[PDB]
């Protein structure tokens, strides 16, 4: 088997483990001239010198010399196309017609006083930026082992720590995380007498904390429309199958959520940067397009195989819907649909920033056995290959590798993911991250220098 | 107390600080014969003599500014009445122009510590867990949490377990600081020179079970280690400031500087950091360098940080003079870059950010086994890697946070104790903490915040 993503492609990827040896033939009639490993590209037709190399329906490079059919195309046989300037990129030149809406889909969630719906019932603890740091982590640890077990309806407790002139990103991120629907309607804020005492201070905090736990323990889930979901998507260990299996499937589920009237988010500026010329045309208008370019140059400025090919594989998670809004690190959306939330690719930082943007569910695609997870929101981990789903059967919540062998289609895995999202949001199924407690501490993005 | 007091740091000073809570009202007289003309709050400066216009303002024996207008004696000097002196260029600062004569050595001082195979001595018996930079991250934090609740309780002689995480994506141009820092932390003596390295299908739960068996083998071996009498020369003490206070440089800092000189005399290694806190006073550290190469190396770290950073305003030069007071009077024998380890013994300058958790993490990487943390605020700062001795600047603070302040230096402001007395009291407190005879409040309540490696490179 070989996988051809788009119809106009002139190259394909080998899926067979160990690759395919010379002599192997395919239905169309071509034949390999040499051995080609799995994940590497093969020429479908004879491509001439300086000839375009097409994959994902776009130019990923040019041939350095004439490449014969059925030959292995290595990174040394291609010339990368230099990315064009940002002021020359087309904006809103091809906004697709909205697909027919999906109505009636629901999930059991926790309705908040502000109208938002949480997928989890958590206790949030924070402190004013002018108070001392270290009290929140100490109190959260005591609440987890001494009180949390007495309130089973409470999914957990999360500490929101501030960092110790231009550092607006970290402050905005911590304040917006406390507005996430999984915290409900009230996060806890902790901050004359000759002898006060530290132990005394903590005793008072634990009394306030037990009052909140008793109230959260009495909350119940109610049937809510799928339009109240906010789903975030990010990549973990980039793989040769990421853009041909998991990513396209996530993009199909992304389009289904947009049709339900929900909010989907894709981030990672470093992962989509070399393909921004394919996102700008999908902006609903120019102000949203220029706002998209503004985030690209901000990150290029902050930073002081085929990168274009990998970027095309990442944007596959965005699906085909229109980009209705662009967010800066830690901002919250004001519109519903496909949103672009600028964030670093670094897994724990991306997750923390998406949680700040208000996601209630996160989908994490990966080609490596990573124990990534968050307590703030349930993390659905999708494998890119079947070999990976079998090796880490207790980490991979869903397998997209069935697309590479033709056993399942992008549409089938996409719908399977959509239904998995509603079941996780309803608490009917627990992701492996929530089953084993794979929760890594929040990592706020701090682009400002440390004093 | 109806006894009015002011604290004059150096003999040549023409200004002092009011110590009485609520300050001193006009009419109050002092032994020398001075008298206040107006009310002056605590922490604020008072003129000891009539200072003329453009006249020098001296504190800590150095010029902190010039008077905007003629200042009469016994008057309150606010930050709007002084003009900061333009700082001179770094290439024009004198190097090794005044290296003090080495003081007579202190012999016989010891502490009960854990001798390592490399010759170092630890003050704590910890389990270090790390992973190769090419492996996936998140496994160490998960395993450490399971070891703390399921195995650690079975091995009481083990003080605790610490996870050492690398950077998300790496192999370099500027990302040498975080790699060097994580590698040097595993060489810290409190890990005993034996950190754990972790990195039909098996599955994730199965992988962890194997790691817990390797972890239980290490805990059983560490649980059998015992402390041995070691010379105080094997100590490595780090010093940093927390909540800057008006008394920091007149009480706790000078006392820490006296204990710093005692440790140097014992043949131990002392460290002071925080580039942002000492930057506006570098012209007083450069002359104490043992030689020019160490002096230019000191200026090199100042400009590296300046480059990296590219009545509501206190005097920055005045605050900096108060911070360098922790360095004492010994000679600076070596300068380190963020996360480097020393090759010489004595007073060392380890460049690090002032940010409390990052400074601590970087000093632990440099090899400190004990840290002294001065502060004027009730902070719950602490580290698991090394015991943290928290020193209060005011007696009012030591009483308000009696379960956080390990030692009180506020007795200097009221004249009940001297810099020398509090300095020796700190030195003996350090030996007792290093021996495990006394437990700091940070280790008693478990005020341990996760390590925060300094990452000056942008995150992708
Ligand atoms: Ca990522
Ligand atoms: Ca099928
Ligand atoms: Ca500090
Ligand atoms: Ca006395
Ligand atoms: Ca205790
Ligand atoms: Cl020299
Ligand atoms: Cl040096
Ligand atoms: Cl080094
Ligand atoms: Cl004594």
From Swiss-Prot, chain A:
<dbReference type="Pfam" id="PF04295">
    <property type="entry name" value="GD_AH_second"/>
</dbReference>
<keyword id="KW-0408">Iron</keyword>
<comment type="pathway">
    <text>Carbohydrate acid metabolism; galactarate degradation; D-glycerate from galactarate: step 1/3.</text>
</comment>
<keyword id="KW-0479">Metal-binding</keyword>
<dbReference type="GO" id="GO:0046392">
    <property type="term" value="P:galactarate catabolic process"/>
</dbReference>
<dbReference type="InterPro" id="IPR052172">
    <property type="entry name" value="UxaA_altronate/galactarate_dh"/>
</dbReference>
<dbReference type="InterPro" id="IPR013974">
    <property type="entry name" value="SAF"/>
</dbReference>
<dbReference type="GO" id="GO:0008867">
    <property type="term" value="F:galactarate dehydratase activity"/>
</dbReference>
<dbReference type="Pfam" id="PF08666">
    <property type="entry name" value="SAF"/>
</dbReference>
<comment type="function">
    <text>Catalyzes the dehydration of galactarate to form 5-dehydro-4-deoxy-D-glucarate (5-KDG).</text>
</comment>
<protein>
    <recommendedName>
        <fullName>Galactarate dehydratase (L-threo-forming)</fullName>
        <ecNumber>4.2.1.42</ecNumber>
    </recommendedName>
</protein>
<dbReference type="InterPro" id="IPR017654">
    <property type="entry name" value="GarD-like"/>
</dbReference>
<dbReference type="InterPro" id="IPR007392">
    <property type="entry name" value="GD_AH_second"/>
</dbReference>
<dbReference type="InterPro" id="IPR044144">
    <property type="entry name" value="UxaA/GarD_SAF"/>
</dbReference>
<comment type="subunit">
    <text>Homodimer.</text>
</comment>
<comment type="similarity">
    <text>Belongs to the UxaA family.</text>
</comment>
<dbReference type="Pfam" id="PF20629">
    <property type="entry name" value="GD_AH_C"/>
</dbReference>
<dbReference type="InterPro" id="IPR032893">
    <property type="entry name" value="GarD_Enterobacteriaceae"/>
</dbReference>
<dbReference type="GO" id="GO:0042803">
    <property type="term" value="F:protein homodimerization activity"/>
</dbReference>
<dbReference type="InterPro" id="IPR048332">
    <property type="entry name" value="GD_AH_C"/>
</dbReference>
<dbReference type="GO" id="GO:0019698">
    <property type="term" value="P:D-galacturonate catabolic process"/>
</dbReference>
<dbReference type="GO" id="GO:0008198">
    <property type="term" value="F:ferrous iron binding"/>
</dbReference>
<keyword id="KW-0456">Lyase</keyword>
């Amino acid at each position: 088997f070989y996988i051809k993503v788009h119809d106009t492609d002139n190259v394909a990827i080998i899926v067979n483990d160990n690759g395919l040896k010379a002599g192997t033939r395919f239905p169309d009639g071509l034949e390999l001239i040499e051995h080609i490993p799995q994940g590497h590209k093969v020429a479908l037709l004879d491509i001439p010198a300086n000839g375009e190399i097409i994959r994902y329906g776009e130019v990923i490079g040019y041939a350095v010399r004439a490449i014969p059919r059925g030959s292995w195309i290595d990174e040394s046989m291609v010339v990368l196309p230099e990315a064009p300037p940002l002021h020359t990129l087309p904006l809103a030149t091809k906004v697709p017609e909205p697909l027919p809406p999906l109505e009636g889909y629901t999930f059991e969630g926790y309705r908040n006083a502000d109208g938002s719906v949480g997928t989890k019932n958590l206790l949030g603890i924070t402190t004013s930026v002018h108070c001392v740091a270290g009290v929140v982590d100490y109190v959260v640890k005591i609440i987890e082992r001494d009180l949390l077990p007495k309130y089973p309806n409470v999914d957990g407790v999360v500490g929101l720590n501030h960092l110790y002139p231009a550092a607006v990103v970290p402050i905005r991120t911590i304040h917006n995380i406390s507005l996430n629907p999984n915290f409900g309607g009230e996060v806890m804020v902790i901050g004359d007498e000759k002898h006060v005492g530290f132990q005394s201070m903590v005793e008072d905090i634990l009394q306030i904390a037990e009052r909140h736990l008793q109230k959260l323990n009495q909350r119940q889930r109610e049937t809510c429309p799928a339009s109240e979901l906010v789903v975030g998507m990010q990549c973990g260990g980039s793989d040769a199958f990421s853009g041909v299996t998991a990513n396209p499937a996530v993009g199909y589920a992304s389009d289904l959520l947009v049709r339900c009237g929900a909010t989907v988010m894709f981030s990672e500026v470093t992962e989509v940067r070399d393909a921004i010329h394919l996102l700008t045309p999908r902006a609903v208008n120019e102000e949203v397009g220029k706002r998209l370019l503004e985030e690209m140059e901000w990150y290029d400025n902050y930073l002081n195989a085929n990168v274009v090919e990998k970027a095309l594989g990442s944007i596959a998670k965005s699906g085909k819907s229109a980009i209705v809004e662009v967010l800066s690190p830690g901002q919250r959306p004001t519109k519903r649909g496909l949103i672009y939330a600028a964030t670093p690719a670094s897994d724990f930082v991306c997750g923390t920033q998406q949680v700040a943007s208000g996601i209630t569910v996160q989908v994490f695609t990966t080609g490596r056995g990573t124990p990534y997870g968050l307590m703030a929101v349930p993390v659905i981990k999708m494998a890119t290959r079947t070999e990976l789903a079998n090796r880490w059967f207790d980490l991979m919540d869903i397998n997209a590798g069935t697309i590479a062998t033709g056993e399942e289609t992008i549409e089938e895995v996409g719908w399977k993911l959509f239904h998995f999202i509603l079941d996780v949001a309803s608490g009917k199924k627990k992701t492996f991250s929530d089953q084993w407690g794979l929760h890594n501490q929040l990592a706020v993005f701090n682009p400002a220098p440390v004093t």
